[PDB]
Amino acid sequence: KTYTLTDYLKNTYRLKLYSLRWISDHEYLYKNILVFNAEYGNSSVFLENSTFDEFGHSINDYSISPDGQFILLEYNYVKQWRHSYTASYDIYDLNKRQLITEERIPNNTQWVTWSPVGHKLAYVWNNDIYVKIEPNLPSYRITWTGKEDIIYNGITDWVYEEEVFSAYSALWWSPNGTFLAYAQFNDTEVPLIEYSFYSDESLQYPKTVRVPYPKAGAVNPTVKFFVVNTDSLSSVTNATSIQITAPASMLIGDHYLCDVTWATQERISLQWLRRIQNYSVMDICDYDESSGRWNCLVARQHIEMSTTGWVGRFRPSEPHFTLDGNSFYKIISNEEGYRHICYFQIDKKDCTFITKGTWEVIGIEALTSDYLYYISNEYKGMPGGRNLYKIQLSDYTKVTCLSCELNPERCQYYSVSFSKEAKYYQLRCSGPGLPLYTLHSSVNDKGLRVLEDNSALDKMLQNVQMPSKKLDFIILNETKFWYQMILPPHFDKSKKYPLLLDVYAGPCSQKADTVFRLNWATYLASTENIIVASFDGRGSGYQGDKIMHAINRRLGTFEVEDQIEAARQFSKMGFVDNKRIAIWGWSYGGYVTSMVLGSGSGVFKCGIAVAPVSRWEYYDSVYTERYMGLPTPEDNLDHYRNSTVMSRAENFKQVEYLLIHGTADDNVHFQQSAQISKALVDVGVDFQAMWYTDEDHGIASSTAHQHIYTHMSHFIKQCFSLP
Ligand X SMILES: Cn1c(=O)c2c(nc(N3CCNCC3)n2Cc2ccccc2Cl)n(C)c1=O
Ligand Y SMILES: *[C@@H]1O[C@H](CO)[C@@H](O[C@@H]2O[C@H](CO)[C@@H](O)[C@H](O)[C@H]2NC(C)=O)[C@H](O)[C@H]1NC(C)=O
Report in angstroms the alpha-carbon separations of 176 from 179, 244, 508: 8, 20, 36
Q: Is 353 helix (H, G, I), strand (E, B) or coil?
A: strand
- Minimum distance, C-beta of residue 706 to its own copies, in the bound complex (Å): 6
Rounded Cα–Cα distance for residues 224 and 241 (Å)? 11
Q: Which does 188 bind (CB under 5 to 8 A by kind): ligand X, ligand Y, its own copies, none?
A: ligand Y
Which of 620, 665, 666, 696 is an active site residue?
665
The answer to whether residue 172 forms part of the interface with ligand X (CB under 6 A) is: no
Task: Indicate the residue among 69 and 145 with the shorter CB distance to ligand Y.
Answer: 145
The answer to whether residue 240 forms part of the interface with ligand Y (CB under 6 A) is: no
To the query of whether residue 587 is one of the catalytic residues in this protein, the response is yes
Report in angstroms the alpha-carbon separations of 265 from 15, 81, 225, 369, 615: 41, 33, 18, 18, 47
- Contacts of residue 252, defined as CB under 8 A and 6 or more positions apart, other chains included, come to none
The answer to whether residue 189 forms part of the interface with ligand Y (CB under 6 A) is: yes
Rounded Cα–Cα distance for residues 337 and 547 (Å)? 9
Tell me which stretch binds ligand Y (CB under 6 A): 55-63, 143-151, 558-566, 705-713. Answer: 143-151
Number of residues that bind ligand X (CB under 6 A): 15
Q: Which does 681 bind (CB under 5 to 8 A by kind): ligand NAG, ligand X, its own copies, none?
A: its own copies
- Minimum distance, C-beta of residue 153 to ligand Y, in the bound complex (Å): 9
The correct pick among 91, 112, 151, 515 for binding ligand Y (CB under 6 A) is 151
To the query of whether residue 50 is one of the catalytic residues in this protein, the response is no
Tell me which stretch binds ligand X (CB under 6 A): 16-24, 425-433, 521-529, 586-594. Answer: 586-594
Which of 587, 614, 621, 673 is an active site residue?
587
**437: left (phi > 0), else alpha (psi -120 to 50), else beta?**
beta
User: Binding to ligand Y (CB under 6 A): which residues in 491-510?
Assistant: none
Q: Note whether 671 and 616 are within 8 A (CB).
A: no
Q: Note whether 585 and 610 are within 8 A (CB).
A: yes
Which positions touch ligand NAG (CB under 6 A)?
Answer: 35, 37, 40, 42-44, 88, 104, 106-107, 144, 176, 178, 231, 237-238, 265-266, 276, 278-279, 305, 307, 629
The answer to whether residue 163 forms part of the interface with ligand X (CB under 6 A) is: yes
Task: Indicate the residue among 220 and 412 with the shorter CB distance to ligand Y.
Answer: 220
Q: Which residue is nearest to ligand NAG (CB)?
A: 265
The answer to whether residue 640 forms part of the interface with ligand X (CB under 6 A) is: no
Q: Which does 580 bind (CB under 5 to 8 A by kind): ligand Y, its own copies, ligand X, none?
A: none
Q: Note whether 94 and 70 are within 8 A (CB).
A: yes
Task: Indicate the residue among 221 and 467 with the shorter CB distance to ligand Y.
Answer: 221
Residue 528 exposed, middle or buried by CB count within 10 Å (0-12, 13-18, 19+): buried
The answer to whether residue 587 forms part of the interface with ligand X (CB under 6 A) is: yes
Rounded Cα–Cα distance for residues 338 and 677 (Å)? 41
* Sequence-distant contacts of 40-44: CB under 8 A, at least 24 apart: 41/439, 41/448, 41/449
The answer to whether residue 70 forms part of the interface with ligand X (CB under 6 A) is: no
- Residues 455/459/460/463 CA torsion (nearest 10 deg): 150
> How many other C-beta atoms can be found within 10 angstroms of the C-beta atom of residue 475?
9
The answer to whether residue 186 forms part of the interface with ligand Y (CB under 6 A) is: yes
- Minimum distance, C-beta of residue 479 to ligand NAG, in the bound complex (Å): 24
The correct pick among 161, 162, 304, 502 for binding ligand X (CB under 6 A) is 162
Report in angstroms the alpha-carbon separations of 157 from 29, 105, 111, 334, 434: 32, 22, 13, 34, 39
Q: Which does 37 bind (CB under 5 to 8 A by kind): its own copies, ligand NAG, ligand X, none?
A: ligand NAG
User: Binding to ligand X (CB under 6 A): which residues in 304-323?
Assistant: 314
Q: What is the DSSP string of 555-622?
A: TTSHHHHHHHHHHHHHHTTSSEEEEEEEEEEETHHHHHHHHHHTS--S--SEEEEES----GGGSBHH
User: Binding to ligand X (CB under 6 A): which residues in 467-526?
Assistant: 504, 506
Q: Kindly list the strands in the beta sheet with 399-401, ordered across the sheet, starting from the edge strand earlier in the chain.
A: 361-367, 371-376, 387-392, 399-401
- Minimum distance, C-beta of residue 504 to its own copies, in the bound complex (Å): 25
The answer to whether residue 238 forms part of the interface with ligand Y (CB under 6 A) is: yes
Task: Indicate the residue among 140 and 623 with the shorter CB distance to ligand X.
Answer: 623
**700: left (phi > 0), else alpha (psi -120 to 50), else beta?**
alpha
Which positions touch its own copies (CB under 8 A)?
Answer: 191-196, 198, 201, 204-206, 208, 215, 217-218, 615, 617-618, 644, 646, 663, 669-671, 674-675, 677-679, 681-684, 686, 688-694, 703-704, 706-707, 710-711, 714
- Minimum distance, C-beta of residue 187 to ligand Y, in the bound complex (Å): 8
Q: Which does 265 bind (CB under 5 to 8 A by kind): ligand X, ligand Y, ligand NAG, none?
A: ligand NAG
The correct pick among 389, 623, 640, 715 for binding ligand X (CB under 6 A) is 623
- Contacts of residue 454, defined as CB under 8 A and 6 or more positions apart, other chains included, come to 15, 16, 434, 435, 436
Tell me which stretch binds ligand Y (CB under 6 A): 181-189, 209-217, 537-545, 580-588. Answer: 181-189
The correct pick among 330, 340, 386, 697 for binding ligand X (CB under 6 A) is 697
The answer to whether residue 589 forms part of the interface with ligand X (CB under 6 A) is: yes
Rounded Cα–Cα distance for residues 285 and 242 (Å)? 12
Rounded Cα–Cα distance for residues 73 and 625 (Å)? 40
Rounded Cα–Cα distance for residues 253 and 413 (Å)? 42
- Contacts of residue 101, defined as CB under 8 A and 6 or more positions apart, other chains included, come to none
**Using CA of residue 391, residue 394, residue 396, residue 397, what is the dihedral sign?**
negative
Q: Please list every residue in the chain followed by a chain break, i.e. its C lies more than 2.5 Å from the next written N.
A: 31
- Minimum distance, C-beta of residue 670 to ligand X, in the bound complex (Å): 13
Closest CA to 568 of 522, 610, 599: 599
Tell me which stretch binds ligand Y (CB under 6 A): 55-63, 83-91, 183-191, 532-540. Answer: 183-191
To the query of whether residue 494 is one of the catalytic residues in this protein, the response is no
- Minimum distance, C-beta of residue 150 to ligand Y, in the bound complex (Å): 7
Task: Indicate the residue among 142 and 170 with the shorter CB distance to ligand X.
Answer: 170
Rounded Cα–Cα distance for residues 220 and 163 (Å)? 13
The answer to whether residue 188 forms part of the interface with ligand Y (CB under 6 A) is: yes
- Minimum distance, C-beta of residue 246 to ligand Y, in the bound complex (Å): 14
CB burial readout 423-437, b (16+ within 10 A) else e: bbbbbbbbbbbbbbb
The answer to whether residue 667 forms part of the interface with ligand X (CB under 6 A) is: yes
Q: Note whether 532 and 521 are within 8 A (CB).
A: yes
- Determine if the peptide bond prior to 432 is cis (ω within 30°): yes
Task: Indicate the residue among 230 and 355 with the shorter CB distance to ligand NAG.
Answer: 230
Give the interface with ligand Y as residue ranges (CB under 6 A).
Answer: 144-145, 151, 186, 188-189, 238
Positions that interact with ligand X (CB under 6 A) = 162-163, 314, 504, 506, 586-589, 613, 619, 623, 667-668, 697
The catalytic residues are 587, 665, 697
